[PDB]
Write a protein that binds this ligand. Structure first.
Ligand SMILES: Cc1cc2nc3c(=O)[nH]c(=O)nc-3n(C[C@H](O)[C@H](O)[C@H](O)COP(=O)(O)OP(=O)(O)OC[C@H]3O[C@@H](n4cnc5c(N)ncnc54)[C@H](O)[C@@H]3O)c2cc1C
Ligand SMILES: Cc1cc2nc3c(=O)[nH]c(=O)nc-3n(C[C@H](O)[C@H](O)[C@H](O)COP(=O)(O)OP(=O)(O)OC[C@H]3O[C@@H](n4cnc5c(N)ncnc54)[C@H](O)[C@@H]3O)c2cc1C
Ligand SMILES: CC(=O)c1ccc[n+]([C@@H]2O[C@@H](COP(=O)([O-])OP(=O)(O)OC[C@@H]3O[C@@H](n4cnc5c(N)ncnc54)[C@H](OP(=O)(O)O)[C@@H]3O)[C@@H](O)[C@H]2O)c1
Ligand SMILES: CC(=O)c1ccc[n+]([C@@H]2O[C@@H](COP(=O)([O-])OP(=O)(O)OC[C@@H]3O[C@@H](n4cnc5c(N)ncnc54)[C@H](OP(=O)(O)O)[C@@H]3O)[C@@H](O)[C@H]2O)c1
Lengths: 446, 446
């Protein structure tokens, strides 16, 4: 009786469970499933917590999400092909929902699927070891409800623990004497903490854009963004400027490669994350920077040194929810014997060709399109519903232009669903004025 | 060739190395020693970092220490019996040195001992397993310098990883709505971050007393302390009050079991720590609250279910540095065969009698005196130099009275060394006015 361990109940682990349940619903015999989740509820990043650093059990706090976060790209680019926004909400809604709204949506699918029963919440995965003599994995966990550590044997293991939770936090000279708060983006919670302050944001990617936008929207006095290689380059509001990189700090001031200098109240390092798996030894352990094509993953999913071990969602993410689906459906089919694996040599050659293409990429359009091609290849192999990928790529193109037009109003635009054709209505309140982030305020009138 | 693993190079792991080195200096053959330390330098808590949450490798940040921290008790109560303050500094100093000064002192002893060579820095212990078949331990670590995970075999393991680093962080109704910073004492770094703010401190023990004192000294507008059981009782300054526990928080305000309420800018949970050992399964893992006599430790040191495993410094700490010495010398002597262990039944009965006495303790004096008795029993069994414990107890008595007299000036008093007899002079600057926490300002004549 074959047995599967799924590590994590975020979007990826939820998709993995959904994938199996869907095969079962069609009448197939499926493996026994156990899913381990260290948090008290599913949803992963989208499960908000006020906690910071270490959680109530002493495990690293997982979510990096903050008050007032809304979708960074069109919801239409992340809609599940087997569970639409229309089905879930019963009505059209706008295109960039707040966190709690997206959280409600991803949970809706697995509530309907009835797969909560497979999950052991409040349980941290400590160790995964492969045993050569038995060809099984031993998974060791800590159940923080009973405060006991136990282990169990599995035939296959699917790792869904994310890669945007363990921060990359570089040091700058003087940090030990600066008098204001220093935090990583991962620790950022309520933008109101910085009302009427001067905030320095170190970095120039999605985290800097959006955390600065929150500080702006909720009333920071002044924002400074500094970049290591090139500026974000958007037209920012009046109280926000982009400088070349921080070089040092003193008691109160930041100094930049500019020769400029000024007083700053708080420093937020928006400097990204590391791939970190403390429960894996080197035989199973993925080591990569954040990118579209990590190596050693056949079809981006199958660990090439031991193809009884799988990874979901370890790539950088233009696409997200329906990419995890495409991967989870594929992992499922491999595990079930529907898609036999080629030799290790063929895997290696295939992965090298995908890496060669990855190194070629220059524009944003080339990047999301490459990821669409990856997804296309996955959904063609499986009964996951095909959806219109070139039309999703075109939605990304529109979104890109909207950001360039005006970085503060991109969230005020609407797109059509590629699953239903339903056009998103305009939201009742422009983003800059929509201060309440609750699901109730978003879905109600006003 | 017998082999020992020492887990941690704070004061306890340094003492364990010092104990073995001292035996060797006297002419004995010692085992091979390997010490693993996840930080880049030794000193444990006393090694200051600006970092918070997770460290540069993604390991939990260890030190809970903050800017401007000074010794909480007389230095005379923590003086090494084999390496005096007079030897280290070459002159008298006042009785409550700043963190950097005490760090320099603890490093001084192990610099002189030459024990740096046994330590692998930037290396995090992941797992310790005991193999019944070989009667050895397998220690698996991650070397963050080479990003390599490897394991090695040991005959004995001494755990020195501390118990004041994994926070106990209780949740209060409304924390997910509150607009200012919420942090644990463990994340507290520079008190200047709170200058001109209203700060609520949840708790009523050493962390609350001292973090409040720092916020006060460096210019917080207003301080509130709230207690769960009973108030700290000291006479606080004008802008600081104590009241019954927090019950809930909204967007801007804290509400107390009082019926009282007010606007607060930051909340600091001074609610203590948990014993947390993510690298130990239940066969080896100590489970206890913070107290003078944890169970399952023969002489407070030998793990009773597997007496080839040892714990140093897991008790609550009135005494500290020379308690770790007493423990480390004892662990050393059992490892080397100088002090054969009694049967498991005898160990149990001994530990029970120590626990029975512990539950008897009511006053502060009874508590440090019991810990003095514990230490006496250890140093009598070993060649650690005897020192005057009743005279150390009388120094605690004076310190207690000084705190009762005035909680803001207790650090301005001086005591005599029980090791050398020499009186500590008065510091050049009253604590409230000594804003500079550097070693250089402290040791200078002005
Ligand atoms: C700040 C931020 C904003 C984002 N915004 C968007 C957005 O607007 N749109 C979008 O499409 N994507 C966004 N993302 C991307 C995000 O990666 C995905 O949307 C999605 O959350 C990834 O799903 P996942 O399940 O792979 O990983 P995660 O959501 O990270 O979930 C991993 C799960 O693994 C669990 N886990 C980890 N370690 C252990 C362990 N040792 N034991 C047991 N359980 C463990 C965690 O508790 C968590 O539940 C954002 C990410 C961040 C960090
Ligand atoms: C805020 C605060 C203030 C204090 N003030 C005083 C004071 O004024 N006077 C006093 O006498 N005592 C004070 N203490 C008490 C403190 O417990 C002791 O002084 C002393 O530091 C205990 O030493 P230790 O080596 O047992 O533990 P620690 O100092 O905590 O050191 C443990 C070592 O283990 C390492 N480690 C942990 N986990 C791993 C791992 N998995 N792998 C590898 N290495 C690991 C850590 O990096 C660390 O170096 C204070 C404690 C705190 C928290
Ligand atoms: C479709 C869409 O909306 C989309 C597409 C992709 C990703 N995402 C989102 O983006 C992700 C989140 O993205 P992220 O911004 O958290 O992290 P990254 O993007 O990896 O880069 C931060 C990096 O930080 C900077 N940095 C690193 N070290 C630095 C240093 N020493 N000094 C100054 N800056 C430093 C880097 O600059 P440099 O390396 O010099 O440029 C780079 O800007 C996820 O949340 C995902 O959801 C969304
Ligand atoms: C000789 C000497 O100087 C000495 C002696 C011992 C310790 N220390 C130092 O003190 C240590 C550090 O001591 P610490 O204050 O960090 O931790 P503890 O003392 O364990 O208690 C915090 C606890 O927090 C309170 N608390 C817990 N949950 C609460 C809740 N839900 N609401 C309100 N309050 C709550 C407890 O109240 P309650 O439980 O209700 O009282 C108690 O006050 C170390 O730094 C050590 O160096 C020094």
């Amino acid at each position: 009786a074959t047995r599967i361990a799924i590590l994590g109940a975020g979007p990826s682990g939820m998709a993995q469970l959904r994938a199996f349940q869907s095969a079962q619903e069609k009448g197939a015999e499926i493996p026994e499933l156990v899913c381990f989740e260290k948090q008290a509820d599913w949803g992963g990043q989208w499960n908000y917590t006020w906690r910071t650093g270490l959680d109530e059990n002493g495990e690293p706090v997982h979510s990096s999400m903050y008050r007032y976060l809304w979708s960074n790209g069109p919801k239409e680019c992340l809609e599940f092909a087997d569970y639409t926004f229309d089905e879930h909400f019963g009505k059209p809604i706008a295109s960039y929902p707040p966190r709690e709204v997206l959280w409600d949506y991803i949970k809706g699918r697995v509530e309907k699927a009835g797969v909560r029963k497979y999950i052991r919440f409040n349980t941290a995965v400590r160790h995964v070891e492969f045993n050569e003599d038995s060809q099984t994995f031993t998974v060791t966990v800590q159940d923080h409800t009973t405060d006991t550590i136990y282990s169990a044997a599995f035939d296959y293991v699917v790792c869904c623990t994310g890669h945007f939770s363990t921060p990359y936090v570089p040091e700058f000279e003087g940090f030990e004497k600066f008098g204001g708060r220093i935090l990583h983006a991962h620790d950022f919670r309520d933008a109101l903490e910085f009302k009427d302050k001067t905030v320095l944001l170190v970095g120039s990617s999605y985290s800097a854009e959006d955390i600065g936008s929150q500080c702006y929207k909720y009333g920071a006095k002044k924002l400074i963004s500094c970049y290591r290689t090139a500026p974000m380059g958007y037209k920012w509001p009046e109280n926000w400027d982009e400088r070349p990189n921080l070089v040092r700090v003193d008691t109160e001031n930041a100094y930049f490669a500019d020769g400029s200098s000024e007083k700053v109240d708080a420093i937020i390092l928006c400097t990204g994350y590391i791939h970190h798996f403390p429960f894996l030894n080197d035989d199973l352990r993925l080591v990569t920077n954040n990118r579209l094509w990590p190596l050693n993953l056949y079809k981006g999913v199958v660990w090439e040194d031991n193809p009884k071990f799988f990874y979901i969602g370890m790539q950088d993410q233009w696409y997200s929810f329906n990419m995890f689906d495409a991967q989870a459906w594929y992992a499922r089919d491999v595990i079930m014997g529907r898609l036999p694996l080629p030799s290790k040599e063929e895997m290696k050659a295939d992965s090298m060709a995908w890496r060669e293409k990855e190194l070629t990429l220059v524009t944003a359009e080339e990047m999301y399109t490459y990821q669409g091609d990856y997804i296309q290849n996955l959904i063609d192999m499986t009964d996951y519903p095909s959806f219109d990928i070139p039309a999703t790529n075109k939605t990304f193109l529109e979104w890109k232009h909207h950001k360039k037009e005006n970085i503060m109003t991109f969230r005020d635009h609407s797109y059509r669903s590629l699953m239903t054709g339903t056009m998103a209505p305009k939201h009742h309140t422009p983003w800059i004025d929509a201060l309440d982030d609750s699901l109730e305020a978003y879905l109600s009138d006003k």
